[PDB]
């Protein structure tokens, strides 16, 4: 039915804050009510400029705990993304403010802004996704191109590698599920052989 008053009033206040913010007027962040009692929200953030994510928009599932504001929201990327601190499979996020560094003065606005800042500054030595973190460290340029490909396919960003696109359409035309294909190629250094071998393992 209803959450505790302190939680209700905090979410209402923070929701209004996002609605009125310069950041939402500049189309950088937003929040949408999913549930009338404020326990679930949907966020969106713009990819930051001069990153592989630029031009993309990333949707977020936000669940507000009963203990709000003393524990963080649970946040997950709905939009698929290629980033060392986010699971390429589940959208689970590795960020201290969602874990052990939450403070009660933090808000929906500052969480959304911190997630955009995380896109612009990955921490690969404390990763959520080992495969992506390894690629980020061992082959920066391949990482950038892969992240940009995912931004284009999943988040609506304008550009991506023609090479990569051709490999994807090749495997999709061969009868494999497109998401499976993207994942396989992205995880196997874009090598059609090892990616195909992985796809046949299923
Ligand atoms: Ca209740």
From Swiss-Prot:
Which keywords describe this protein according to UniProt? Answer: Acetylation, ATP-binding, Cytoplasm, Isopeptide bond, Nucleotide-binding, Phosphoprotein, Transferase, Ubl conjugation, Ubl conjugation pathway
How is this protein annotated for GO cellular component?
cytoplasm; cytosol; filopodium tip; nucleus
One GO BP on record is: positive regulation of peptidyl-threonine phosphorylation
Instruction: Write down the EC number.
Output: 2.3.2.23
Q: Name one GO molecular function term.
A: ubiquitin protein ligase binding
Give the domain of life: Eukaryota
Q: What induces it?
A: By aggregated low-density lipoprotein.
Swiss-Prot/TrEMBL catalytic activity: S-ubiquitinyl-[E1 ubiquitin-activating enzyme]-L-cysteine + [E2 ubiquitin-conjugating enzyme]-L-cysteine = [E1 ubiquitin-activating enzyme]-L-cysteine + S-ubiquitinyl-[E2 ubiquitin-conjugating enzyme]-L-cysteine
Modified residues annotated as N-acetylalanine in this record: 4
Subcellular location(s) per record? Cytoplasm
What does the record give as its pathway?
A: Protein modification; protein ubiquitination
Q: Which SMART domains match?
A: UBA, UBCc
Name the enzyme group at the top EC level: transferase
* Residues covered by the UBA domain: 162-202
Q: Which PANTHER family match?
A: UBIQUITIN-CONJUGATING ENZYME E2 (PTHR24068)
What does the function comment of this entry state? Accepts ubiquitin from the E1 complex and catalyzes its covalent attachment to other proteins. In vitro, in the presence or in the absence of BRCA1-BARD1 E3 ubiquitin-protein ligase complex, catalyzes the synthesis of 'Lys-48'-linked polyubiquitin chains. Does not transfer ubiquitin directly to but elongates monoubiquitinated substrate protein. Mediates the selective degradation of short-lived and abnormal proteins, such as the endoplasmic reticulum-associated degradation (ERAD) of misfolded lumenal proteins. Ubiquitinates huntingtin.
Q: How does it assemble?
A: Interacts with RNF138/NARF. Interacts with BRCA1.
What's this protein's family per the entry?
A: Belongs to the ubiquitin-conjugating enzyme family.
Q: What is this protein called?
A: Ubiquitin-conjugating enzyme E2 K
Please tell me the species this chain comes from. Homo sapiens (Human)
């Amino acid at each position: 039915f209803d959450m505790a008053n302190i939680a209700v009033q905090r979410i209402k206040r923070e929701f209004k804050e996002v609605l009125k913010s310069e950041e939402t007027s500049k189309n950088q962040i937003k929040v949408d009510l999913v549930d009338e009692n404020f326990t679930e929200l949907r966020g969106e953030i713009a990819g930051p400029p001069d990153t592989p994510y630029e031009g993309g928009r990333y949707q977020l599932e936000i669940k507000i705990p009963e203990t709000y504001p003393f524990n963080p929201p649970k946040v997950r990327f709905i939009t698929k993304i290629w980033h060392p601190n986010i699971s390429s499979v589940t959208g689970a996020i590795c960020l201290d403010i969602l874990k052990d560094q939450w403070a009660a003065a933090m808000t929906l606005r500052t969480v959304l802004l911190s997630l955009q800042a995380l896109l612009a500054a990955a921490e690969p030595d404390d990763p959520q996704d080992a495969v992506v973190a390894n690629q980020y460290k061992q082959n920066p340029e391949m990482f950038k191109q892969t992240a940009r490909l995912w931004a284009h396919v999943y988040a609506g960003a304008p550009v991506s590698s023609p090479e990569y696109t051709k490999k994807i359409e090749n495997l999709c035309a061969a009868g494999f599920d497109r998401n499976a294909v993207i994942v396989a190629l992205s995880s196997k250094s874009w090598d059609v052989e090892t990616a195909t071998e992985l796809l046949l393992s299923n």
